[PDB]
Design a protein around this motif. Sequence first.
Motif, PDB file in Angstrom:
ATOM      1  N   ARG B  86     -21.745 -50.347  36.648  1.00 53.85           N
ATOM      2  CA  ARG B  86     -22.286 -48.807  36.408  1.00 53.85           C
ATOM      3  C   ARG B  86     -21.435 -48.376  35.613  1.00 53.85           C
ATOM      4  O   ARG B  86     -20.358 -48.640  35.084  1.00 53.85           O
ATOM      5  N   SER B  87     -22.062 -47.185  35.055  1.00 49.88           N
ATOM      6  CA  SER B  87     -21.603 -46.165  34.062  1.00 49.88           C
ATOM      7  C   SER B  87     -21.395 -44.680  34.923  1.00 49.88           C
ATOM      8  O   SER B  87     -22.260 -43.983  34.915  1.00 49.88           O
ATOM      9  N   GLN B  88     -19.953 -44.563  35.350  1.00 43.21           N
ATOM     10  CA  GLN B  88     -18.805 -45.564  35.018  1.00 43.21           C
ATOM     11  C   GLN B  88     -18.796 -46.280  36.307  1.00 43.21           C
ATOM     12  O   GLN B  88     -19.441 -46.620  37.116  1.00 43.21           O
ATOM     13  N   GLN B  89     -17.489 -47.084  36.269  1.00 43.59           N
ATOM     14  CA  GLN B  89     -17.150 -47.968  37.243  1.00 43.59           C
ATOM     15  C   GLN B  89     -16.793 -47.445  38.480  1.00 43.59           C
ATOM     16  O   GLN B  89     -16.459 -47.883  39.642  1.00 43.59           O
ATOM     17  N   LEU B  90     -16.409 -46.136  38.445  1.00 43.23           N
ATOM     18  CA  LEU B  90     -16.094 -45.423  39.696  1.00 43.23           C
ATOM     19  C   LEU B  90     -17.131 -45.016  40.672  1.00 43.23           C
ATOM     20  O   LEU B  90     -16.697 -44.921  41.720  1.00 43.23           O
ATOM     21  N   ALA B  91     -18.353 -44.984  40.207  1.00 42.40           N
ATOM     22  CA  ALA B  91     -19.740 -44.742  41.223  1.00 42.40           C
ATOM     23  C   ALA B  91     -19.776 -46.137  42.039  1.00 42.40           C
ATOM     24  O   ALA B  91     -20.225 -45.773  43.245  1.00 42.40           O
ATOM     25  N   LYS B  92     -19.528 -47.376  41.398  1.00 44.59           N
ATOM     26  CA  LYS B  92     -19.654 -48.541  42.016  1.00 44.59           C
ATOM     27  C   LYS B  92     -18.379 -48.846  43.112  1.00 44.59           C
ATOM     28  O   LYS B  92     -18.886 -49.265  44.159  1.00 44.59           O
ATOM     29  N   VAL B  93     -17.490 -48.223  42.876  1.00 44.83           N
ATOM     30  CA  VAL B  93     -16.375 -48.364  43.589  1.00 44.83           C
ATOM     31  C   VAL B  93     -16.372 -47.607  44.663  1.00 44.83           C
ATOM     32  O   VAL B  93     -16.078 -47.758  45.923  1.00 44.83           O
ATOM     33  N   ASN B  94     -16.860 -46.312  44.495  1.00 40.33           N
ATOM     34  CA  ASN B  94     -16.920 -45.469  45.639  1.00 40.33           C
ATOM     35  C   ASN B  94     -18.338 -45.749  46.557  1.00 40.33           C
ATOM     36  O   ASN B  94     -18.358 -45.472  47.733  1.00 40.33           O
ATOM     37  N   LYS B  95     -19.232 -46.299  45.792  1.00 33.47           N
ATOM     38  CA  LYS B  95     -20.329 -46.987  46.567  1.00 33.47           C
ATOM     39  C   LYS B  95     -19.904 -48.042  47.601  1.00 33.47           C
ATOM     40  O   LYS B  95     -20.525 -48.275  48.521  1.00 33.47           O
ATOM     41  N   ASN B  96     -19.054 -49.005  47.039  1.00 35.45           N
ATOM     42  CA  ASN B  96     -18.446 -50.242  47.997  1.00 35.45           C
ATOM     43  C   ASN B  96     -17.561 -49.547  49.174  1.00 35.45           C
ATOM     44  O   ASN B  96     -17.531 -50.020  50.122  1.00 35.45           O
ATOM     45  N   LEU B  97     -16.875 -48.598  48.694  1.00 35.50           N
ATOM     46  CA  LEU B  97     -15.886 -47.971  49.646  1.00 35.50           C
ATOM     47  C   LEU B  97     -16.599 -47.159  50.678  1.00 35.50           C
ATOM     48  O   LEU B  97     -15.893 -46.702  51.508  1.00 35.50           O
ATOM     49  N   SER B  98     -17.756 -46.612  50.021  1.00 37.19           N
ATOM     50  CA  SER B  98     -18.675 -45.649  51.493  1.00 37.19           C
ATOM     51  C   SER B  98     -19.232 -46.743  52.438  1.00 37.19           C
ATOM     52  O   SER B  98     -19.358 -46.237  53.604  1.00 37.19           O
ATOM     53  N   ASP B  99     -19.480 -48.069  52.107  1.00 36.14           N
ATOM     54  CA  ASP B  99     -19.920 -49.011  53.101  1.00 36.14           C
ATOM     55  C   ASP B  99     -18.648 -49.911  53.861  1.00 36.14           C
ATOM     56  O   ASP B  99     -18.876 -50.331  54.749  1.00 36.14           O
ATOM     57  N   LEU B 100     -17.583 -49.754  53.056  1.00 31.76           N
ATOM     58  CA  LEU B 100     -16.552 -50.781  53.612  1.00 31.76           C
ATOM     59  C   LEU B 100     -15.787 -49.925  54.850  1.00 31.76           C
ATOM     60  O   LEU B 100     -15.180 -50.880  55.662  1.00 31.76           O
ATOM     61  N   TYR B 101     -15.692 -48.751  54.912  1.00 32.69           N
ATOM     62  CA  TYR B 101     -15.281 -48.181  56.074  1.00 32.69           C
ATOM     63  C   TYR B 101     -16.350 -48.199  57.169  1.00 32.69           C
ATOM     64  O   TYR B 101     -15.754 -48.369  58.404  1.00 32.69           O
ATOM     65  N   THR B 102     -17.730 -48.314  57.071  1.00 34.34           N
ATOM     66  CA  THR B 102     -18.568 -48.600  58.219  1.00 34.34           C
ATOM     67  C   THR B 102     -18.444 -49.856  58.673  1.00 34.34           C
ATOM     68  O   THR B 102     -18.714 -50.293  59.680  1.00 34.34           O
ATOM     69  N   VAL B 103     -18.389 -50.973  57.608  1.00 33.45           N
ATOM     70  CA  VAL B 103     -18.077 -52.273  57.882  1.00 33.45           C
ATOM     71  C   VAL B 103     -16.808 -52.654  58.566  1.00 33.45           C
ATOM     72  O   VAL B 103     -16.758 -53.461  59.888  1.00 33.45           O
ATOM     73  N   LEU B 104     -15.924 -52.002  58.327  1.00 31.32           N
ATOM     74  CA  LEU B 104     -14.493 -51.947  58.982  1.00 31.32           C
ATOM     75  C   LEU B 104     -14.534 -51.250  60.583  1.00 31.32           C
ATOM     76  O   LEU B 104     -13.991 -51.786  61.306  1.00 31.32           O
TER      77      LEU B 104
END
Lengths: 159, 113, 52, 56, 168, 112
Positions: B86-104
């Motif tokens: 994505r542009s930028q790469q921080l939006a995809k990292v925040n998108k994965n980090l928003s679901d990683l806390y729910t999966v954890l």
Amino acid sequence: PTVQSLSERKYSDEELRQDISNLKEILENEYQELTSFDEYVAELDSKLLCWSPPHVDNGFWSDNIDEFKKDNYKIFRQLIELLQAKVRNGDVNAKQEKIIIQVALNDITHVVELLPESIDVLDKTGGKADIMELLNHSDSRVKYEALKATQAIIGYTFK
Amino acid sequence: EFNIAAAIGASVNYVTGVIARDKVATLEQILWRVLRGNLFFKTVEIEQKNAFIVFSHGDLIIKRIRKIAESLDANLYDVDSSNEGRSQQLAKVNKNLSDLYTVLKTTSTTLES
Amino acid sequence: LTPNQVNDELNKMQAFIRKEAEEKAKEIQLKADQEYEIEKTNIVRNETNNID
Amino acid sequence: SQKNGIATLLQAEKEAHEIVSKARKYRQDKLKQAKTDAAKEIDSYKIQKDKELKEF
Amino acid sequence: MATALYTANDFILISLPQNAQPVTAPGSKTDSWFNETLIGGRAFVSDFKIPEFKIGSLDTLIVESEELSKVDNQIGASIGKIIEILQGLNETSTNAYRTLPINNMPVPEYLENFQWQTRKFKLDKSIKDLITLISNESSQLDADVRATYANYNSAKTNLAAAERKKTG
Amino acid sequence: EQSLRVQLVRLAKTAYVDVFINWFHIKALRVYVESVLRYGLPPHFNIKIIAVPPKNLSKCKSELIDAFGFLGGNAFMKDKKGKINKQDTSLHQYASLVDTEYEPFVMYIINL
């Protein structure tokens, strides 16, 4: 599976144990003697999922993953469309759809773990949100299978 | 972030990574100036529990500094994450980090149950 | 340690970056200038025998 | 002055990238100029052969 | 003191640009600071500058510096092995072959006239071919003297057993 | 043994002269490569060979390192003078190939 647990006990009259070994070998040979592609396509077309010892193996999903690829994962998109169709409309998390939802999630977890290209089939159909919405509801075994599939997709999404 | 656009496309070579010793980063900065000329930029960011190092290099010498950076107990690579589509790469990292806390949280609730 | 040496290192850091690109472009033009004449001579030598 | 030294080296790297691309553009222009220089060169010999054939 | 060689003439090679200044004596050039700013005033300065050798890009200089350092270490080990074999042969003193003249010229006068002159290298040739051919010729020249010294040691070892077996 | 001694002596001297000339040309090429890579602009630099007597290399290396050490930078120089060539320790090696210390400018030591 109960024949293997009952085969651990041994006593006199060993002809019944030979009948248990012949029933376990005949059940294992008869269960493995069936086709996995026609049985999986007939079970997916029938709208009914059931667990089995050979159906839950990674070799059958890995062997059927190559033969299933004829329409860009049309079989996995049909199974994800059946699980998303049953979970989306029809009282999902109920008696009827609860077995096919957990069986489709557990069967989809081995296919998601075996191939890292199954995320496009779930994102194209729309079954990616069904695992996240089903992960925080009842049927916590199906939420553990969908959490295992979401952890398998999350493991390949970020390294 | 380091009005500059040199992390969204390809117009500069950057080396970001985490380290636990500033003395190895100073020796890596002196070794980069001694073995590759005046090309590294001295940047320091307070982390924790750690030390954030950021260095710059050319677009044709990234493979040469990866041996000294990997052998210096550092992770000075081109990117620190796998989400850069994505542009930028921080939006995809925040998108994965928003679901990683729910999966954890779901894995923690399933493990506790 | 001093900040005055940063511009002195950045001047040669930019001069080497310009000299590498000029050194690459001179070799690229030196190769293409011979490759064009080799292609034209191969074209004319390919055409003359078919003409005769 | 933290963002000035990286911006100067980034501008020098961009100018070196454009100067590296200009030699490739001129190398492509010479590659077009080779066949463009030979295609007008074949017609001078073809008409020279046809002029020697029309007399016979 | 045992931190360096004190049985031969030592040399220090330094290189700097035309805009540097010393920190031990301000307001002085590097040429006058080399002879006048030296310790005790006994440091002899000689000319050692050389022209360009067709150096390519900056990426090839880092790969060429490691091969030049390895070839300089191999040539330094081969010269020390040849000088150690010549000093071990019992034909010269401990100071010979390290401070004596080479080709009828002294080390400071020959080092001051070293303007990148060779009989197999030129200013228009590459540095990789001369750096490889110099290490190959030095390796073959060291290997020939090592094989001749091994053959002389085997001939002396056979001559010792022949002389002891002859009588005594 | 006599012919191998004479041929080993003549080949030892004739190989030693070309080995010394090749070592001097390799050091002259490495000094120009390190001086051209370290300084950058201009392409022509002033390099010379200083003939120092024995037992005075520490004062010439300390005076040249303290005088020309500020040209490379303010963090690359070191206050360590001399070297250690003992049998139970190989630290304080003056060179740019070790992690114990580095040189603050273009300078090499030649021990014949």
